[model samples]
Target chain A: EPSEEEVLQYIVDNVNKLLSRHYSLVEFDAIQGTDLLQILADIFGTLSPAQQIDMGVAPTDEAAASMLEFLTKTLGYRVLADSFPTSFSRAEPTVIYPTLYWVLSNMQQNEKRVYLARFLQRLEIPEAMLAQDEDVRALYQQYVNLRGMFVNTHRRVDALRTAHADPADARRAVTVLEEECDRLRGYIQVAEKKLAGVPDKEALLNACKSLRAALEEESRLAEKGVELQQQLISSRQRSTEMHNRLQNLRRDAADGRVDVIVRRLRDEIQTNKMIIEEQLPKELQQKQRENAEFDRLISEPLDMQALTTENQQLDEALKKLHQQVKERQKPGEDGSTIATIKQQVERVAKRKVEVMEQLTGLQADNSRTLNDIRERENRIEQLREAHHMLKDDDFREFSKQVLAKKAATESMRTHLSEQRVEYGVLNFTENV
Target chain B: YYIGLLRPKITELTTEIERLNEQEELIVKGGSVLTQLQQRNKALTDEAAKLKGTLADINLALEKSTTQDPSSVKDQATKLNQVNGEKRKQVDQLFLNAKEMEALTKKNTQALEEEMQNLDRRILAENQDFGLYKATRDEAFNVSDAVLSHQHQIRMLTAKQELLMTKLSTDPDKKRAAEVLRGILSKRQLKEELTKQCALSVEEERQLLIKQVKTARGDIEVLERQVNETRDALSESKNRCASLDEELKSYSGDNIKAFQELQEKDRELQSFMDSFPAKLKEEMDKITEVQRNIATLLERISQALE
Candidate 1:
């Protein structure tokens, strides 16, 4: 597994598989220290391109020292300078192998994260489903608006929580202000009560007379306001009563009796509203005498003619229905007779499935001809292009160069594909 | 400071109103997810109320809606139709439950049929016992009926006798009837006196027997004490005999060595007996420890249940 001295051969194998891009030609077994700095820089660059390790293409010993500095200083791996005080040597798995392992793992994790980032990028197209629905799009837009609103609201709410000053200073000022305010208030009240000059009887009478007139005038306005308020209340009651009546006049009715009852109820409700809004107790009592007579007269009729007519009509209708039902009644059929018809239909269904089975190959041939027809279309396209195009020297050279570059790109692509496979295969020991 | 004097009341009200305005705003300004949920809940409940209103209207218009308080033709018909369809699900569910319960009832009935025969045999014996009790009850009832009839007859006869005596007193034969009645009352008095004497004697004998029973119980108690004393002494004598036999056997086989072993064991037992209370105290301490754990564990279990 190793030379006479101990070596972790598996680490060497893994490092080879992992760093296939830049270290493909390097002997991974007992890694030579000369290519170490470049290998690390390449691995670190692949992980992230942040700290540009500007070692020359063929890195030097001094560059290795600085790269070790980058590892210890920037990357925060503390083992390097202390573990290998001397420059890296041809036989130093103890130092090189462990650092390579850490570097390669960083590359591995970076790639995994990129995969997740790509997966997240691919996630939004399904959100496109919401765009097509007429109602769903509006709802989704509302949700988006709400979410955006929520973000601002959440920020402001937290800002209030974290940024408020204690109200003690304002309260202290307010307390002083309150005392001053109360003192001024007492003074105002005292001033209002105090006589300005000697109370002359003649002037006092004149002033009192004017105030009396003003008070009387104000009282009339106050009385008018109450009158208008009462008017408004009556107006509201009338509108509500009319709305009820209009609804009834529009709907008409339930079964004949319910409709009559509904009409009577509407009338009673309107009368009740009029009493509630407009009537004084004495006025209401006088009206109740009229209402009592109305009820008395209405109750006296108790009309039996219409009731008998309705009852007789319903009985006649029921008699007619019974006659019709009796005439329509008939005997039932045998179930076996119907089942015989069912079996015939089922036999036809079985025959249909057999025909469908027989037609399967012919349908496939029809489908296969569509592929041929597509090929024929492309052929016709080429033939059309063949009519006008000349393969002149300019086009010829362009084609050759285009193809030449394409071949080179193809080779690179092939190598990269192999490199990716080799890169991931370190996780699978059996692949070795 | 002069600002306070610059119409301080006006300024104070202005500042106070402004402070109140901002305070109202501050209360209005804070929002949380639950408040958003409150909005959501309001929306959901609005739709739910609308749903309830429409359903209520439909149900109100249907003929069978009230069930016990018992139509524009299409409105009435459609309302009843939808209600019927709605109730069909309930009917089907009832059918399912009914069928399941019927099956279980039948199954239990069959399972209990074997038990029914055994139980019926016991019931038959109990029924016969019931019949005997019923017969005795009937016999007592017949006697009570006869006694009631006899009492009524006797009361009738007394009323007749008093009526006849009153009539006779009003007429001529009252003195002879009075004489006969006096003799009859005297004989009845003598019979009652003898019956009282018999009852008094029987009561006296009962008291005497009760006193004898007490005397018998006292002897039993004394005998128990004497027996206990005899038992303890006899037990001690038996133990002494066994101890002597043990010594006699040991004496035949080097008595001095056996005697020294007994003394050694005796001293060891004395020391063990003195330390016995310490062991007992430790065990009692463990009981308190276990009970404390039990109380603590019960509280913890109750907390977990909550």
Candidate 2:
């Protein structure tokens, strides 16, 4: 309610958050109608997109009224239309605040997810609810795939079973098999009677002998197969033993890439430790000592004597110059004169400063005059060229032509008018 | 033959393209790490240079120690301090000498201007006095001329009196002459008394006029002072109005107030956002429980109806 500042602030804040920037409430209250339309368009496009609108919009009253009608119909608020502002710039805060609150509440779902996602990223608890595991996602896809495959396999199995006549149909299956077996025994006795009438009993004897030899050959080859199976067992045993021994040997020498990296790291550590503890600091001391010895050996008495004589002459000459300097500066001991000169200097300094300020003012005026002149000249030049392009003679000729044509046209119009006044109307040909 | 001729070119193009593609891929594989490794190498080289720099600094320090450079520097510091002290004393002495010279010059300039002003005053006074004596002498001569003229008139008047006295003694009745003399004596006595009265009035009126002028002038001065003070007060009032108007104008500017309100709002919103997770979870848990209850109710309804 507008009565509640809390609700107003909450709504206003959420509106700002949804819009990605905070406008002052005063400015927000003064939002133009088109601005409001853009805001609503942006919000609706982001939240629930289908199409966009301008509401027969003109950034004017009709558009504002149209947009107001749209909001009323779209988001569905039942409010009194009378005495309500159609435009945001003229809106009462009491009305607009609550309206905005209602409007921005649509962002709450997205807003809540956004807020929760940050916290979710920080702490993976997921509210004590079982979140989907990483591998569990893959298993879900896997199960989804198998569901179709299982359906297909089941369909295939069912079709095959149907094609085979439902393999174990319950009704009368035993009676069917018993009748089939009785016919099979009758057929066998007829086949024996035919063999007996074949006029050669020796043939049946030969058939028995051949069958016995086949049984013998089958037994011998099968026994050889069993012996080969035993030898194959030994061969597989030898292969396994060799493989195990080879793997062991390779594993013994399995100083893998990790070992190489670890050895390098350790070697570096040892090298760094020894060099730091022993090398650089000790070498520095000896080098410094040797360097100091060279410095010590340089300043012999001969060098000192010669440098002292040079220094003596230079010092005397320096003293002479110093005395000259002292005398020159001594004349400035007239402090009153100096102060008077300083006063004169101050006056001129002030005058110069004032003059400079005046100069700058004049310069500014000069710039302004130049700007005016340049702008005027540029425009005049363009005008000059344009005017030059339209030759005066050509303009005179054109003007004269225009006047002549106008006069002739007027003459024709007068002639027509005279004819109209003199003559009566003639009949018309309809040709219908 | 045409196909065979084109095949070599095609093979060459295709093979070269494959090689070029591999080269591009190889360069892609190496490009990023190339710069990275260069930066790493630069970092290592910079660190090594720093090590050398530190070693050089250590050598300098060690050599400086070996040469007892601190003691040498301390000795130079003392020597320089001694020299600086001498130089400062000399500079102070020069400053004192310079002040003395300026003091003398100032006194001389002051005396010169004072003497010169006094002479000018004397000359100006003398010039003023140059005309006064001439005017005084000229005024004395005029008074002398007036005295001479008065004397002549007095003599003439005395002769006429003598002649009148002779006539008065000789002619007319004795009683009438005595009465005229008495009348003259009485008129002379009254005229002398009137002369004294006029002198007294003149002295008294001069004092009264001067006193009246002094009083009026005093009142005029007070009114003038009051008018000036009122003008000052008017100026102050205008300034006060402008300054306090600025204060009023500034007070109405609500930029800072708006900012404060904005900060409060942002804080509240942020805190609300911070608390959203807990509130959202609670709502979601309640929703889940309601969903389970709905499911249970649906199952019960299914058993009853289906």
Tell me the tens digit of each residue's lDDT in model 1 across B1-306. 222322443343345445545654675544343354446555655555454443333333232222212123334344555655555555555556555644654554454445434543553564434343334434533443343334333333333344334434642433353434344344444444444434443336345545645544443443344334334433443454455444334334344454445445545555655555566566555555555666677788789999
The stretch of ten residues in a row with the least summed lDDT in candidate 2 chain B is B54-63
**Model 1 Cα RMSD, Å?**
59.4
Provide the lDDT at B26 for model 1: 70
TM-score, candidate 1, is 0.16
TM for every model, in the order presented, reads 0.16, 0.14
Where does candidate 1 stray beyond 4 Å? A1-27, A48-59, A80-83, A87-91, A108-432, B1-306
* Residue B250 local lDDT, model 2: 31
What lDDT tens digits, residue by residue, belong to model 2 across residues A1-432? 355666656755766776687877666657644565565555554544432555335455655565465456545555745567533434445566566667677555544343323222222233222244455444334444544444454445445434433222322443454454455445544544444433333333343333333433443443433333333333333333233223222332243233332333333233223234444444444334333333342222123344445445555655565554334333243432223433444555455445434433543343343334334544546644543322346545754655565565556556555544432221111111
Candidate 1 local lDDT, A73-180, one digit each (tens) = 445566544447464533255677677666555655555454333222221234554555556556445544544544455456546655655544544554555555
- Model 1 chain A scores worst on lDDT over the 10 consecutive residues at A116-125
lDDT of 1: 0.44
